[PDB]
From Swiss-Prot, chain B:
Signal peptide coordinates: none
Protein name: Nitric oxide synthase 1
Family as reported in the entry's similarity comment: Belongs to the NOS family.
Post-translational modification comment from the UniProt entry: Ubiquitinated; mediated by STUB1/CHIP in the presence of Hsp70 and Hsp40 (in vitro).
Binding of (6R)-L-erythro-5,6,7,8-tetrahydrobiopterin, residues: S36, V369, W370, F383
Binding, heme b: C107, Y398
Description of how the protein assembles with itself and partners: Homodimer. Interacts with DLG4; the interaction possibly being prevented by the association between NOS1 and CAPON. Forms a ternary complex with CAPON and RASD1. Forms a ternary complex with CAPON and SYN1. Interacts with ZDHHC23. Interacts with NOSIP; which may impair its synaptic location. Interacts with HTR4. Interacts with SLC6A4. Interacts with VAC14. Interacts (via N-terminal domain) with DLG4 (via N-terminal tandem pair of PDZ domains). Interacts with SLC6A4.
Tissue: Isoform 1 is ubiquitously expressed: detected in skeletal muscle and brain, also in testis, lung and kidney, and at low levels in heart, adrenal gland and retina. Not detected in the platelets. Isoform 3 is expressed only in testis. Isoform 4 is detected in testis, skeletal muscle, lung, and kidney, at low levels in the brain, but not in the heart and adrenal gland.
Cell location: Cell membrane, Sarcolemma; Cell projection, Dendritic spine
Domain comment (free text): The PDZ domain participates in protein-protein interaction, and is responsible for targeting nNos to synaptic membranes. Mediates interaction with VAC14.
Function recorded in the entry: Produces nitric oxide (NO) which is a messenger molecule with diverse functions throughout the body. In the brain and peripheral nervous system, NO displays many properties of a neurotransmitter. Probably has nitrosylase activity and mediates cysteine S-nitrosylation of cytoplasmic target proteins such SRR.
Length: 414, 408
């Protein structure tokens, strides 16, 4: 690499200079001769000697941020951690470092358009948790807090870190709140097709399914390497929104609703070499996540045709753009419904405008902002949002959120 | 290693081996991805490039290592020695131009790549001659609405002071004017070019859709102005199948998309004038040309006549207006029997093209950022299609705008 890299916005001609990319850590999958920018996931513990430089890197960074770099406290903190690694093969983050790391993993999340909010994250320290019941307790408190009767607040709950890899804490759910999917014998799918596999695991562990279209899944929670356990989220904690349209009376007749709180629970949080395998986090929805993907993906709820039929569109040509017309109304309904019920939501125009402002500010104050164009650009109306025209650099900074294998493919059953 | 690409909607997985044959750089590194950056020889360097190309050509016709193959190499070697350059056989030129299209990672239309009419204009010596070839091209490609893919190839670069250039970015494009009050009349993307043409003697009608003159440079001389015979320029008035008031907007567009400012690289040879043309995907006009902020910017006006709530962005009034404009564009072209393709059919075809290419070639370079349409992305099949991007040659390359380089 060279020291400086420029990016240009083709709509406004603004040019930004990236220096932060020099602090890049892991690989991207790309080389000089091939780019993997549209590959979803490009490509057991760590040793003592693997861990010293990783912890030091994070500690320096942290003390650099609080304007105390090379201080007495900095050096004493380093001495402490180095001994702890030497005598236990791991170490413990202070409460302040854990909070710094969690906020910075969000800040460094190149596929997140919502990062203008990164510094307003409520961090719940759950490192004292020992059992699955305890996890359930922590998670209920998270959901209630974050939901806040519609006034959603971003939060993250962090469970104890990996030790030897045989005592992992995991949320088996991919999100804290999701709807169930039931593969029918006739090949059809009732509910959310994305969650069919997880639903079956839940039923096997003893879940009694209502077998409806929008059944909130049970939490499946694993503590300290033990077999996972099922708990029902109290229903009064799950905020939902029926979907209606500001002009089409019949839209309520489709019987659609969604949950208010998006809370991913299957990713891994990496801070200074430590691996927090259970770290559910939540913010609020962008309209299209629900309106476009969850509702109109062919392999999700796939309602485009049924909506188009009631709109009385011509559906035999594709050049009538009947799909495109229905899609827009669907997203109008979603936004209308959330707004009317005073539940926090952002439309893709507002969110993308905010990200550009956020990204410019990060370039001035931080020397860059990793961003994944393929993910940052919304799934509809791409070129009429300002991110479409913005050049972006992608690279991996630490602390960070990573993907991790599904726990059922790994778990050694007790 | 072999690499896999998965379509997440159909779960189809293809295996890429073609990338191993790639030789040009992409712009990325192991640490930084530049997938969304728009723009990331002497005797000595020339023969290996020449040899590589001739090798792959004779490979393509199943005569690799033949007598003809060796003799061709010897011929190209001796010619590079004695002249510092070499000339391509007619067949090599046609193979070359088709494969530059085939390798064009940003092009969603490559299912058509081997159906390409190639006009060899390498005997051309003057701007007038260029004008001639270009009119013949436009007439052939337009074909009274039944558009036919073509490219016209002018003489290759030599010492770099005798370049052939088409100064237009496209053969047919509308003028753009800087108004006294600051606004722009017409296409803002062409305001600078329009000013260069007026500086050179062009008398502008100063309307919203004025077809620009050709500005042709031959052998490195000052460019010259030419008027395309108006009977060769096919245009479509844009009207809407439900909204009768839409014609009142007075929008039109030209039928023939003909990019003329790029460089064709074959076997180490640089062709700096090589205008090529196909037909439009609707969104190119109905999303980008009409609704970009820096373009004609008509969303607001259309949403007015649709009488939508334009106070909040969360009414998605822009999105609604946008779909209607693209309905109008498709509807108008089809009613005028002018070849056009909607982004659903075109992305569907590309997925099928990928399938064929992985089968017969062991891969297909594709730029996901450019292949996904600028509206309704995830309801087209390419959104969910993983792609590998890498640079194969022959290729189309960007080159600097001529006015930054030329000395008059
Ligand atoms: C508060 C408002 C937020 C908004 C509007 C928002 C928006 C989004 C969207 C739209 C995506 C892409 C999801 C998709 O299309 O599939 C995304 C990705 C992501 N976000 Fe945010 N998000 C928010 C909060 C957060 C928070 C609080 C965190 C972490 C503390 C976070 C971390 C991430 C990560 C790690 C991804 C990438 C997920 C992946 O790799 O699949 N986000 N965000
Ligand atoms: C026949 C119908 C064709 C269709 C529907 C088509 C479609 C497209 C589209 C939609 C783009 C993206 C343009 C943009 O969004 O700005 C594109 C780019 C491109 N097309 Fe095709 N194309 C066709 C024919 C051709 C031909 C005949 C050639 C050359 C022989 C060609 C070479 C290219 C190249 C090199 C690009 C990339 C432009 C760049 O890198 O700046 N296309 N095409
Ligand atoms: C393609 C499926 O993969 C994802 C898709 C979306 C997200 C994700 C993750 C976090 C979010 C958050 C925190 C807020 C929000 N509005 N949307 C979010 C979306 C995560 C993942 C990772 N499993
Ligand atoms: C800054 C954007 O640059 C481009 C974008 C698109 C194209 C292009 C090039 C050829 C096309 C062809 C041949 C057909 C078609 N329908 N669209 C085409 C579009 C060229 C260029 C290069 N001037
Ligand atoms: C193939 C492609 O990489 C994949 O479908 C991506 C494209 N961009 C995306 N962008 C967002 N925000 N979310 C996604 O799930 C995806 N999916
Ligand atoms: C920043 C980004 O690379 C740039 O705006 C690209 C994005 N994708 C595109 N895709 C197409 N087909 N045409 C374009 O001009 C662009 N512009
Ligand atoms: Zn890359």
């Amino acid at each position: 690499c060279p020291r400086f890299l420029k990016v240009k916005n083709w709509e406004t001609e603004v040019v930004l200079t990236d220096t932060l990319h020099l602090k890049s850590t892991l690989e991207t999958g790309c080389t000089e001769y091939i780019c993997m920018g549209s590959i979803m996931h490009p490509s057991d513990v760590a040793t003592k000697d693997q861990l010293f430089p990783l912890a030091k890197e994070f500690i320096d960074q942290y003390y650099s941020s609080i304007k105390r770099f090379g201080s007495k406290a900095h050096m004493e903190r380093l001495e402490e951690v180095n001994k702890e690694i030497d005598t236990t093969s791991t170490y413990q983050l202070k409460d302040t470092e854990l909070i710094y790391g969690a906020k910075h993993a969000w800040r460094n999340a190149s596929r997140c358009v919502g990062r203008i909010q990164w510094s307003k994250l409520q961090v719940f320290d759950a490192r004292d948790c020992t059992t699955a019941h305890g996890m359930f307790n922590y998670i209920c408190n998270h959901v209630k807090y974050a939901t806040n009767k519609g006034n959603l607040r971003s939060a993250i709950t962090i469970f104890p870190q990996r030790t030897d890899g045989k005592h992992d804490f995991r949320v088996w759910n991919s999100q804290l709140i999701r709807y169930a999917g039931y593969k029918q014998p006739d090949g059809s799918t009732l509910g959310d097709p994305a969650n069919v596999q997880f639903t079956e695991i839940c039923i096997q562990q003893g879940w009694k399914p209502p077998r409806g279209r929008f059944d909130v899944l049970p939490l499946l929670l694993q503590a300290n390497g033990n077999d996972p356990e099922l708990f029902q989220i109290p229903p009064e904690l799950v905020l939902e929104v029926p979907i209606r349209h500001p002009k089409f009376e019949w839209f309520k007749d489709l019987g659609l609703k969604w949950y208010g709180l998006p809370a991913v629970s299957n990713m891994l949080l990496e801070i200074g070499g430590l691996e927090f395998s259970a770290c559910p986090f939540s913010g609020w929805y962008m309209g299209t996540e629900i309106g476009v993907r969850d509702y109109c993906d062919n392999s999700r709820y796939n309602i485009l045709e049924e909506v188009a039929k009631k709109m009385n569109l011509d559906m035999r040509k594709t050049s009538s753009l009947w799909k495109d017309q229905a899609l827009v109304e669907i997203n109008i309904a979603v936004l209308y419904s959330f707004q009317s019920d005073k539940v926090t939501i952002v439309d893709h125009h507002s969110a993308t405008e905010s990200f550009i402002k956020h990204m410019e500010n990060e370039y001035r104050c931080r020397g860059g902002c990793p961003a994944d164009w393929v993910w940052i650009v919304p799934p509809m109306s791409g070129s009429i949002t300002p991110v479409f025209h913005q050049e972006m650099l992608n690279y991996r900074l630490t602390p960070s959120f990573e993907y991790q294998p599904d726990p059922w493919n790994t778990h050694v059953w007790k």
